[PDB]
Design a protein around this motif. Structure first.
Motif, PDB file in Angstrom:
ATOM      1  N   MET A 284     -24.871 -21.801   1.222  1.00  0.00           N
ATOM      2  CA  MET A 284     -24.760 -20.728   0.516  1.00  0.00           C
ATOM      3  C   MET A 284     -24.254 -21.151  -1.007  1.00  0.00           C
ATOM      4  O   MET A 284     -23.229 -22.105  -0.821  1.00  0.00           O
ATOM      5  CB  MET A 284     -23.753 -19.734   0.722  1.00  0.00           C
ATOM      6  N   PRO A 285     -24.479 -20.475  -2.207  1.00  0.00           N
ATOM      7  CA  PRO A 285     -24.041 -21.023  -3.419  1.00  0.00           C
ATOM      8  C   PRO A 285     -22.679 -20.423  -3.832  1.00  0.00           C
ATOM      9  O   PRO A 285     -22.251 -19.337  -2.887  1.00  0.00           O
ATOM     10  CB  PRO A 285     -25.061 -19.980  -4.491  1.00  0.00           C
ATOM     11  N   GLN A 286     -21.781 -21.032  -4.817  1.00  0.00           N
ATOM     12  CA  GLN A 286     -20.618 -20.651  -4.943  1.00  0.00           C
ATOM     13  C   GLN A 286     -20.262 -20.902  -6.582  1.00  0.00           C
ATOM     14  O   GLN A 286     -19.457 -21.253  -6.855  1.00  0.00           O
ATOM     15  CB  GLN A 286     -19.609 -21.425  -4.308  1.00  0.00           C
ATOM     16  N   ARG A 287     -21.474 -20.181  -7.319  1.00  0.00           N
ATOM     17  CA  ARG A 287     -21.105 -20.580  -8.846  1.00  0.00           C
ATOM     18  C   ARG A 287     -20.342 -19.688  -9.471  1.00  0.00           C
ATOM     19  O   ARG A 287     -19.622 -20.005 -10.466  1.00  0.00           O
ATOM     20  CB  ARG A 287     -22.493 -20.371  -9.447  1.00  0.00           C
ATOM     21  N   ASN A 288     -20.109 -18.291  -8.940  1.00  0.00           N
ATOM     22  CA  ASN A 288     -19.342 -17.237  -9.616  1.00  0.00           C
ATOM     23  C   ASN A 288     -18.829 -16.521  -8.676  1.00  0.00           C
ATOM     24  O   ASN A 288     -18.779 -16.708  -7.288  1.00  0.00           O
ATOM     25  CB  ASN A 288     -20.301 -16.240 -10.596  1.00  0.00           C
ATOM     26  N   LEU A 289     -17.832 -15.579  -9.050  1.00  0.00           N
ATOM     27  CA  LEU A 289     -17.070 -14.866  -8.169  1.00  0.00           C
ATOM     28  C   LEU A 289     -17.669 -13.923  -7.002  1.00  0.00           C
ATOM     29  O   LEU A 289     -17.302 -13.980  -5.815  1.00  0.00           O
ATOM     30  CB  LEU A 289     -15.962 -13.856  -8.699  1.00  0.00           C
ATOM     31  N   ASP A 290     -18.884 -13.552  -7.487  1.00  0.00           N
ATOM     32  CA  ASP A 290     -19.702 -12.754  -6.321  1.00  0.00           C
ATOM     33  C   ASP A 290     -20.075 -13.654  -5.352  1.00  0.00           C
ATOM     34  O   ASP A 290     -20.083 -13.285  -4.142  1.00  0.00           O
ATOM     35  CB  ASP A 290     -20.835 -11.996  -6.900  1.00  0.00           C
ATOM     36  N   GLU A 291     -20.943 -14.898  -5.662  1.00  0.00           N
ATOM     37  CA  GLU A 291     -21.077 -15.680  -4.451  1.00  0.00           C
ATOM     38  C   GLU A 291     -19.997 -16.374  -3.815  1.00  0.00           C
ATOM     39  O   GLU A 291     -20.200 -16.683  -2.496  1.00  0.00           O
ATOM     40  CB  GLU A 291     -22.231 -16.898  -5.271  1.00  0.00           C
ATOM     41  N   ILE A 292     -18.884 -16.721  -4.250  1.00  0.00           N
ATOM     42  CA  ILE A 292     -17.687 -17.040  -3.698  1.00  0.00           C
ATOM     43  C   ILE A 292     -17.313 -16.017  -2.724  1.00  0.00           C
ATOM     44  O   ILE A 292     -17.049 -16.533  -1.559  1.00  0.00           O
ATOM     45  CB  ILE A 292     -16.719 -17.351  -4.648  1.00  0.00           C
ATOM     46  N   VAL A 293     -17.059 -14.935  -3.157  1.00  0.00           N
ATOM     47  CA  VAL A 293     -16.535 -13.693  -2.060  1.00  0.00           C
ATOM     48  C   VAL A 293     -17.434 -13.531  -1.203  1.00  0.00           C
ATOM     49  O   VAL A 293     -17.287 -13.618   0.144  1.00  0.00           O
ATOM     50  CB  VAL A 293     -16.394 -12.553  -3.062  1.00  0.00           C
ATOM     51  N   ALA A 294     -18.958 -13.593  -1.279  1.00  0.00           N
ATOM     52  CA  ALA A 294     -19.932 -13.305  -0.533  1.00  0.00           C
ATOM     53  C   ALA A 294     -19.608 -14.549   0.682  1.00  0.00           C
ATOM     54  O   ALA A 294     -20.037 -14.398   1.975  1.00  0.00           O
ATOM     55  CB  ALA A 294     -21.272 -13.421  -0.878  1.00  0.00           C
ATOM     56  N   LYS A 295     -19.629 -15.823   0.122  1.00  0.00           N
ATOM     57  CA  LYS A 295     -19.645 -16.913   1.102  1.00  0.00           C
ATOM     58  C   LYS A 295     -18.230 -16.812   1.966  1.00  0.00           C
ATOM     59  O   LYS A 295     -18.349 -17.179   3.328  1.00  0.00           O
ATOM     60  CB  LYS A 295     -19.534 -18.400   0.428  1.00  0.00           C
ATOM     61  N   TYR A 296     -17.040 -16.325   1.352  1.00  0.00           N
ATOM     62  CA  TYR A 296     -16.013 -16.290   2.159  1.00  0.00           C
ATOM     63  C   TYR A 296     -15.956 -15.101   3.137  1.00  0.00           C
ATOM     64  O   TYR A 296     -15.369 -15.403   4.389  1.00  0.00           O
ATOM     65  CB  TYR A 296     -14.787 -15.704   1.120  1.00  0.00           C
ATOM     66  N   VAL A 297     -16.740 -13.863   2.844  1.00  0.00           N
ATOM     67  CA  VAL A 297     -17.257 -12.810   3.824  1.00  0.00           C
ATOM     68  C   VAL A 297     -18.034 -13.507   5.101  1.00  0.00           C
ATOM     69  O   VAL A 297     -17.656 -13.079   6.215  1.00  0.00           O
ATOM     70  CB  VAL A 297     -17.686 -11.916   3.139  1.00  0.00           C
TER      71      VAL A 297
ATOM     72  N   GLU B  53     -14.826 -24.245  -8.732  1.00  0.00           N
ATOM     73  CA  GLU B  53     -15.811 -23.487  -9.522  1.00  0.00           C
ATOM     74  C   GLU B  53     -15.454 -22.973 -10.759  1.00  0.00           C
ATOM     75  O   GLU B  53     -16.173 -22.597 -11.638  1.00  0.00           O
ATOM     76  CB  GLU B  53     -16.675 -22.836  -8.572  1.00  0.00           C
ATOM     77  N   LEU B  54     -14.430 -22.031 -10.519  1.00  0.00           N
ATOM     78  CA  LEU B  54     -13.650 -21.191 -11.625  1.00  0.00           C
ATOM     79  C   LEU B  54     -12.379 -21.700 -12.401  1.00  0.00           C
ATOM     80  O   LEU B  54     -12.052 -21.022 -13.105  1.00  0.00           O
ATOM     81  CB  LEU B  54     -13.523 -19.698 -11.068  1.00  0.00           C
ATOM     82  N   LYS B  55     -11.926 -22.635 -11.770  1.00  0.00           N
ATOM     83  CA  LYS B  55     -10.709 -23.126 -12.256  1.00  0.00           C
ATOM     84  C   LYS B  55      -9.658 -22.082 -12.182  1.00  0.00           C
ATOM     85  O   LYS B  55      -8.800 -21.869 -13.123  1.00  0.00           O
ATOM     86  CB  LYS B  55     -10.739 -23.746 -13.722  1.00  0.00           C
ATOM     87  N   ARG B  56      -9.807 -21.399 -10.861  1.00  0.00           N
ATOM     88  CA  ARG B  56      -8.886 -20.176 -10.777  1.00  0.00           C
ATOM     89  C   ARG B  56      -8.242 -20.447  -9.427  1.00  0.00           C
ATOM     90  O   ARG B  56      -9.093 -20.789  -8.367  1.00  0.00           O
ATOM     91  CB  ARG B  56      -9.222 -18.841 -11.050  1.00  0.00           C
ATOM     92  N   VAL B  57      -6.979 -20.026  -8.888  1.00  0.00           N
ATOM     93  CA  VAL B  57      -6.754 -19.770  -7.501  1.00  0.00           C
ATOM     94  C   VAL B  57      -6.331 -18.319  -7.357  1.00  0.00           C
ATOM     95  O   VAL B  57      -5.907 -17.645  -8.348  1.00  0.00           O
ATOM     96  CB  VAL B  57      -5.648 -20.575  -7.085  1.00  0.00           C
ATOM     97  N   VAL B  58      -5.961 -17.856  -6.211  1.00  0.00           N
ATOM     98  CA  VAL B  58      -5.382 -16.612  -6.093  1.00  0.00           C
ATOM     99  C   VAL B  58      -3.886 -16.473  -6.148  1.00  0.00           C
ATOM    100  O   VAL B  58      -3.129 -17.419  -5.343  1.00  0.00           O
ATOM    101  CB  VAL B  58      -6.045 -16.006  -4.819  1.00  0.00           C
ATOM    102  N   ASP B  59      -3.323 -15.801  -6.898  1.00  0.00           N
ATOM    103  CA  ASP B  59      -1.884 -15.511  -6.827  1.00  0.00           C
ATOM    104  C   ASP B  59      -1.678 -14.666  -5.544  1.00  0.00           C
ATOM    105  O   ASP B  59      -2.036 -13.251  -5.687  1.00  0.00           O
ATOM    106  CB  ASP B  59      -1.233 -14.885  -8.004  1.00  0.00           C
ATOM    107  N   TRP B  60      -1.416 -14.899  -4.332  1.00  0.00           N
ATOM    108  CA  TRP B  60      -1.382 -14.017  -3.269  1.00  0.00           C
ATOM    109  C   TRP B  60      -0.327 -12.844  -3.482  1.00  0.00           C
ATOM    110  O   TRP B  60      -0.348 -11.885  -2.718  1.00  0.00           O
ATOM    111  CB  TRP B  60      -1.402 -14.788  -1.969  1.00  0.00           C
ATOM    112  N   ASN B  61       0.651 -12.866  -4.372  1.00  0.00           N
ATOM    113  CA  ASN B  61       1.542 -11.755  -4.341  1.00  0.00           C
ATOM    114  C   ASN B  61       0.984 -10.579  -5.203  1.00  0.00           C
ATOM    115  O   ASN B  61       1.703  -9.537  -5.346  1.00  0.00           O
ATOM    116  CB  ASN B  61       3.107 -12.239  -4.866  1.00  0.00           C
TER     117      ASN B  61
END
Lengths: 198, 198, 198, 200
Positions: free
Chosen positions: A90-103, A130-138
């Motif tokens: 599965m692709p992981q280029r943007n947030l939609d594809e990354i969230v879809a892959k995570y799901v 892919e986005l140079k971001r991580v989740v701030d889980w707080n």
């Protein structure tokens, strides 16, 4: 059912939390976290083994039985090999594809236990690469997270919204990672320790 | 996308209902319904092609694309062949096993469209062979049926209950079959014709 | 926030289990359980206070804010009195009406905490008075119970089926009661003690 | 099947005439300008809309129901809470999209009439949006399946329906065709497709 001599589930909860949180701290601090394949089952398995190899023999291994957690419909074993191969492609280029892959990987849940915590680490690495971001889980409330994940096979809008609004560019912030570990364990109900004190 | 020259979805719904109900009437009256393999994808495919071959090119064939409808995921194409082979091997000795099998074939939803109507005919044939009963569909309310089907991937108790309390021994009663066809189409929102008047 | 000064949640859970279970043991053995109003909020409040007056203030008292559990839609505070008045007038002549009343009281969830355990005791007393049955809680699997309760506002068939198959006429069997207390605490995650050893 | 002012005893024919007569009333509601003289955002105004659409067909038109109604995956408000619930909804704010959607979600749960709640409340929603945001919904930008799924989800989380609404907002708040198309789509959401309102 564990490698240590634990016959009581509450004691196992505490010990699993402590040992695996120790391993997560070392995963980050040694730099090992940055030498794993990103977005792949091989990488997810590496993370899971790293967290849990001291506690469970099945660590890092694809499960052999079906799993039953609430009414959530995880992949039955017979699709599992097929599912992971699909997820590997599965692709992981943007947030939609990354969230879809995570799901999809949340549905596959390939290990006997520890899927949620290991997979949250895996997701953050995909976001970082892919986005140079991580989740701030707080920035993600626990009940909103759990509800959003249970909803995610039908519509991933809720989980996408939570992640998108929790994105930070501080992808090398040790504090974001370590607190993310504590929050990730809190989502699954393990709160006896703070990882930074281990 | 259809074999006729139709550009309007409402006109397509009208003609699809009429043609496929004509075919369902013929399926019963010609005795063809009695010559079909019971409880297998082969038999289900025969039914679906029989109803829909005038309208759709894909009639009786496993779909190639995913379908998304309501609150649970149907089988994705990548699992479908495994799923149908598994379903062919499921037992059908009693009502519990017949309902479990029906629930799995409903999840499989192997055709592009028309899964519900074809699979209800298929279910009545399994019941007729193994229990000498058919479903009196007039004893199953539409709202109850839909709610129970949506619940069944988690727990099939609701659909099992509706089915068992509608079981009748009039397994060769033409009128029960025909009203069952009209009701089955009403469950999906098609009410422009009465099958016995076609 | 409790009557002892306990500031650790895992510690409070341990003592809450043991003390409240002692109060439950006394409730049965003193015979006080048999002189409480059956099927009314007054009776439920008496049960709840008896269990929890040592650990919590507000025990037996209507909550003042909204509560949540997962996505379950409990009654909001502003309707609570109306709900409780309504529940006081619901009939309890057969199993259908009793389960329906239990489902409304589960939705009402009138206390800040302890609704599940207090209300399961209240349900058993309604059944004993009206059907001369109690629930053998050993015949109701935990995951089936929790799932059935979450489903019950939409359709109460699942919980009705579990209760109906767990009914026993041993309404003076002390162990059926005490084991029912242990199983009821296990439903909510308290597994440290056996009440009969207290 | 429901009692009705016409002599109709068949549910499919009642569906046809109800669709026709009430869509006629909706066309006249807009074209006469009556829609502009209704209180916005209160149960009084929703009641006015509902009576306007349905008074020829049902005696209960515009009136709070007296029994519970049950459909789908969540409980609508029971009668015993209904008066209080509507009083509360009347007092809910409506300054921005979050508050308007929350208010719409509460009114959908209240479902105060015996039948016809969905259609009347969608008109009511558009009037609220028009007054407070100077937007209406272009209902051609909200798919049926997406709409229904989002509504079922909304008592738990209104994010999905909020997303559909916000992405369908248009500033053409006096475009007659936007309204009439919205009426046809709103009836399509509930399964009524026998007529086109502009052809009435």
């Amino acid at each position: 059912e564990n490698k240590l001599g634990i016959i009581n589930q509450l004691e196992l909860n505490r010990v699993e939390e402590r040992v695996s949180k120790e391993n997560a701290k070392r995963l980050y601090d040694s730099g090992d976290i940055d030498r794993i394949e990103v977005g792949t089952f091989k990488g997810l398995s590496y993370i899971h083994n790293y967290l849990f190899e001291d506690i469970y023999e099945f660590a890092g291994k694809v499960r052999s039985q079906n799993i039953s957690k609430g009414n959530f419909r995880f992949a039955p074993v017979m699709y599992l090999e097929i599912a992971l191969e699909h997820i590997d492609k599965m692709p992981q280029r943007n947030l939609d594809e990354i969230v879809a892959k995570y799901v999809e990987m949340n549905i596959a849940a390939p290990f006997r236990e520890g899927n949620g915590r290991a997979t949250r680490i895996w997701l953050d690495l995909i976001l970082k690469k892919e986005l140079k971001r991580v989740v701030d889980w707080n920035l993600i409330n626990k009940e909103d997270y759990l509800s959003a994940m249970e909803r995610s096979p039908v519509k991933d809008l809720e989980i996408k919204y939570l992640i998108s609004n929790a994105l930070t560019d501080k992808i090398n912030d040790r504090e974001i990672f370590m607190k993310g570990i504590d929050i990730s364990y809190y989502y699954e109900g393990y709160t006896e320790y703070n990882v930074d004190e281990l």
